[PDB]
Amino acid sequence: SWEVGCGAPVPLVKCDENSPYRTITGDCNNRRSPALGAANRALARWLPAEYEDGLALPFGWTQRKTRNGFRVPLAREVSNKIVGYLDEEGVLDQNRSLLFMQWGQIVDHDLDFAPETELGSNEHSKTQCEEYCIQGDNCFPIMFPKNDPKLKTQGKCMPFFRAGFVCPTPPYQSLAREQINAVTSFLDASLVYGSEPSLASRLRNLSSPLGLMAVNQEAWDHGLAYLPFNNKKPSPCEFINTTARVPCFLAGDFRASEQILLATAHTLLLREHNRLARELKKLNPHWNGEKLYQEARKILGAFIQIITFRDYLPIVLGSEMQKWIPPYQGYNNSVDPRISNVFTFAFRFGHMEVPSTVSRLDENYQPWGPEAELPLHTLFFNTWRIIKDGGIDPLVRGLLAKKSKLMNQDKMVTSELRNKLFQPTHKIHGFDLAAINLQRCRDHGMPGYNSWRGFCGLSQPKTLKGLQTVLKNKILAKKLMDLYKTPDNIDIWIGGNAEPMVERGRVGPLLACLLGRQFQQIRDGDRFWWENPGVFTEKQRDSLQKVSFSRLICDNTHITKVPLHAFQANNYPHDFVDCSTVDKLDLSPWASREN
Ligand code: HEM
Ligand SMILES: *[C@@H]1O[C@H](CO)[C@@H](O[C@@H]2O[C@H](CO)[C@@H](O)[C@H](O)[C@H]2NC(C)=O)[C@H](O)[C@H]1NC(C)=O
Ligand SMILES: *[C@@H]1O[C@H](CO)[C@@H](O)[C@H](O)[C@H]1NC(C)=O
Numbered sequence: 168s169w170e171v172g173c174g175a176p177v178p179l180v181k182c183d184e185n186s187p188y189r190t191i192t193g194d195c196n197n198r199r200s201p202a203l204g205a206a207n208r209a210l211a212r213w214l215p216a217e218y219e220d221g222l223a224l225p226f227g228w229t230q231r232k233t234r235n236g237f238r239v240p241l242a243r244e245v246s247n248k249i250v251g252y253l254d255e256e257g258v259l260d261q262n263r264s265l266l267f268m269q270w271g272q273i274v275d276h277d278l279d280f281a282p283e284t285e286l287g288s289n290e291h292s293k294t295q296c297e298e299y300c301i302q303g304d305n306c307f308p309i310m311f312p313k314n315d316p317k318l319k320t321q322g323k324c325m326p327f328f329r330a331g332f333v334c335p336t337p338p339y340q341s342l343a344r345e346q347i348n349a350v351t352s353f354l355d356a357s358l359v360y361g362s363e364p365s366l367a368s369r370l371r372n373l374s375s376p377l378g379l380m381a382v383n384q385e386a387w388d389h390g391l392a393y394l395p396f397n398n399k400k401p402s403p404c405e406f407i408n409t410t411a412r413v414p415c416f417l418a419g420d421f422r423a424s425e426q427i428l429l430a431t432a433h434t435l436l437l438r439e440h441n442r443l444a445r446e447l448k449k450l451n452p453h454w455n456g457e458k459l460y461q462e463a464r465k466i467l468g469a470f471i472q473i474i475t476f477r478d479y480l481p482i483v484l485g486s487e488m489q490k491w492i493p494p495y496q497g498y499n500n501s502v503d504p505r506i507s508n509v510f511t512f513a514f515r516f517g518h519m520e521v522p523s524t525v526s527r528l529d530e531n532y533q534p535w536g537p538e539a540e541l542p543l544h545t546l547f548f549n550t551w552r553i554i555k556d557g558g559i560d561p562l563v564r565g566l567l568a569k570k571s572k573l574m575n576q577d578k579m580v581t582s583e584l585r586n587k588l589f590q591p592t593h594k595i596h597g598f599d600l601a602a603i604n605l606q607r608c609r610d611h612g613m614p615g616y617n618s619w620r621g622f623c624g625l626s627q628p629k630t631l632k633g634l635q636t637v638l639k640n641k642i643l644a645k646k647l648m649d650l651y652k653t654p655d656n657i658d659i660w661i662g663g664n665a666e667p668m669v670e671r672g673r674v675g676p677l678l679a680c681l682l683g684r685q686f687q688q689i690r691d692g693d694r695f696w697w698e699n700p701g702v703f704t705e706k707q708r709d710s711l712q713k714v715s716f717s718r719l720i721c722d723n724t725h726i727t728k729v730p731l732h733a734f735q736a737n738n739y740p741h742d743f744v745d746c747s748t749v750d751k752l753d754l755s756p757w758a759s760r761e762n
């Protein structure tokens with residue numbers, strides 16, 4: 168609320184109700200309600216927002232005001248007391264590859280983005296926030312607690328800007344602040360293509376009628392394509408190594424260059440689109456560029472859907488997969504397709520799956536050169552290590568043969584993210600993602616832990632003893648109670664991640680329920696779901712069923728050896744097979760003549 172830095176450009180389109188293609192914005196998916204799921208609308212609220220003043224001020228804004236009669240603990244202080252740990256030994260997930268973590272970030276970026284308020288460029292507001300740690304309007308700084316080492320080294324706070332929100336509209340009667348989702352709620356490869364028509368065009372190759380995406384014209388990966396550079400300045404990716412001065416990539420998603428392995432995945436996906444287009448041009452020489460672009464975009468969309476539901480969700484949701492996502496029963500035009508506010512915090516479980524280092528491996532999956540293993544923080548906004556240090560293949564190999572971090576109640580978020588995160592506007596490897604997540608929960612008016620437990624029909628701990636029983640962990644419960652006084656006040660991000668994981672899964676009960684429900688809706692509420700009859704032919708669906716991430720790698724790199732199950736932990740060579748033995752996508756069902 169209170170208008171400063173609100174709104175987004177929602178472009179009005181008349182719906183082509185008969186198009187076999189998704190729109191870019193996500194409009195027209197739901198025929199009765201064409202905006203449901205579209206980009207640049209409010210996140211859905213599963214429960215009403217909870218703000219200090221009932222409208223817009225986050226809990227923790229006014230020093231005097233309590234939450235349920237208790238002060239809320241500083242976000243950095245929760246992080247120090249609970250989230251950090253020293254020893255990386257034994258922290259790794261023994262049955263999940265690094266690809267597990269990375270795929271999660273990909274799915275997340277496809278579904279939701281809540282950009283920070285653009286106070287504008289040229290800001291004295293940035294100055295008053297960063298330099299003076301002054302709370303006001305969109306500046307909601309993360310203040311360091313007493314004895315924080317960052318006090319001695321960084322200042323009084325980390326700057327933090329409140330998320331973007333829907334503008335008050337002409338009733339202007341009083342409503343709670345609603346944050347915006349800038350990307351389409353459908354699992355539709357929007358992170359590749361854009362959620363905005365203008366960028367979508369700019370990303371395409373329109374010089375040729377071949378339906379390709381634009382590729383870098385200054386650099387190649389042993390003949391294979393790189394994303395175009397983003398030429399907007401100043402560039403964080405340039406900042407981190409001004410000698411090398413390699414800019415960030417330009418993708419369908421703003422966040423693509425945040426870390427080297429995300430940039431990698433974005434590259435594999437772009438390569439795939441162009442491969443699909445070239446193949447379809449071979450099968451159908453008469454098809455034009457629009458047709459080629461749309462059809463390859465349509466396939467790549469389904470590819471993301473299949474990998475997520477067949478390979479990813481089962482090993483996240485474990486024993487709960489069946490309870491939340493039973494066999495598909497066809498498109499339901501009454502299901503809300505929109506991403507919920509709470510989901511965007513629930514999906515941040517992946518922050519506990521990121522390890523402290525990244526490795527480049529050679530063709531024998533051995534350490535590549537003398538600086539094979541790098542600390543994670545050196546790779547935020549890092550495109551030079553790709554362009555000028557060996558391409559994507561060495562990184563892809565580590566994705567396959569290295570492991571995700573396991574979530575650990577005693578070892579939650581690695582120091583690389585908890586102390587050394589680099590933010591694109593700022594200049595220091597000095598931020599705390601865990602403190603940011605907690606602050607952001609408050610920013611977004613998140614109801615508290617016991618609110619969500621109830622939403623999910625789970626017991627709601629009220630005492631230390633009750634929480635110890637929920638957490639199966641005495642010390643964690645006690646530290647939580649000392650900080651929060653009441654489990655009612657525990658911020659949803661820390662609360663949900665504190666729970667021991669469900670059987671065969673990588674999240675606890677509360678999170679399994681929140682994620683499960685959202686993924687159910689994402690499938691059932693999508694008119695272009697790949698399994699919705701008429702979206703693909705039957706023969707095409709039979710082809711699609713054979714897609715795998717291993718094939719994507721084989722088709723789009725010079726790696727010739729891959730595991731069959733890329734998401735589990737795999738060791739070279741025993742678990743790797745030659746690419747020739749891996750199922751391909753058969754495109755013959757897309758062949759199209761007139762006779
Ligand atoms: C750097 C960051 C990562 C890797 C080194 C990383 C990783 C993940 C995974 C694996 C996720 C899902 C399984 C995931 C989800 C979401 N993230 Fe997170 N992430 C890195 C950095 C960030 C930053 C910075 C943010 C913004 C924090 C803020 O509130 O201002 C961030 C957010 C999220 C998020 C909310 C929406 C979004 O931007 O993705 C997730 C669902 N991540 N990340
Ligand atoms: C857009 O598509 C055209 C045509 O495929 C690309 O042009 C060719 O690019 C390759 C690689 O640079 C060359 O080997 C060919 O000789 C080029 N042929 C033509 C028709 O010029 C062009 O590079 C693509 N543009 C972008 C920006 O991705
Ligand atoms: C790793 O997880 C997958 C889950 O589908 C399972 O099939 C595989 O056997 C697991 N390996 C283990 C638990 O060691």
Ligand SMILES: *[C@@H]1O[C@H](CO)[C@@H](O)[C@H](O)[C@H]1NC(C)=O
Pocket residue numbers: 407408409410411551555
């Ligand atoms: C910057 O890149 C150059 C090569 O471009 C390299 O030799 C140097 O180590 C890099 N410096 C930093 C700051 O990482």
Ligand SMILES: *[C@@H]1O[C@H](CO)[C@@H](O)[C@H](O)[C@H]1NC(C)=O
Pocket residue numbers: 496499500501502
């Ligand atoms: C579809 O959606 C609504 C709300 O989820 C539900 O009541 C209804 O039972 C569903 N109908 C079918 C046919 O699945």
Ligand SMILES: [Ca+2]
Pocket residue numbers: 277278350351352353354355356357358
């Ligand atoms: Ca999307």
Ligand SMILES: [Cl-]
Pocket residue numbers: 211212213214507508509510
């Ligand atoms: Cl919500």
Ligand SMILES: [K+]
Pocket residue numbers: 275276422
């Ligand atoms: K993110």
Ligand SMILES: [Zn+2]
Pocket residue numbers: 388389725
């Ligand atoms: Zn090569």
Ligand SMILES: [Zn+2]
Pocket residue numbers: 297592593594
């Ligand atoms: Zn700064």
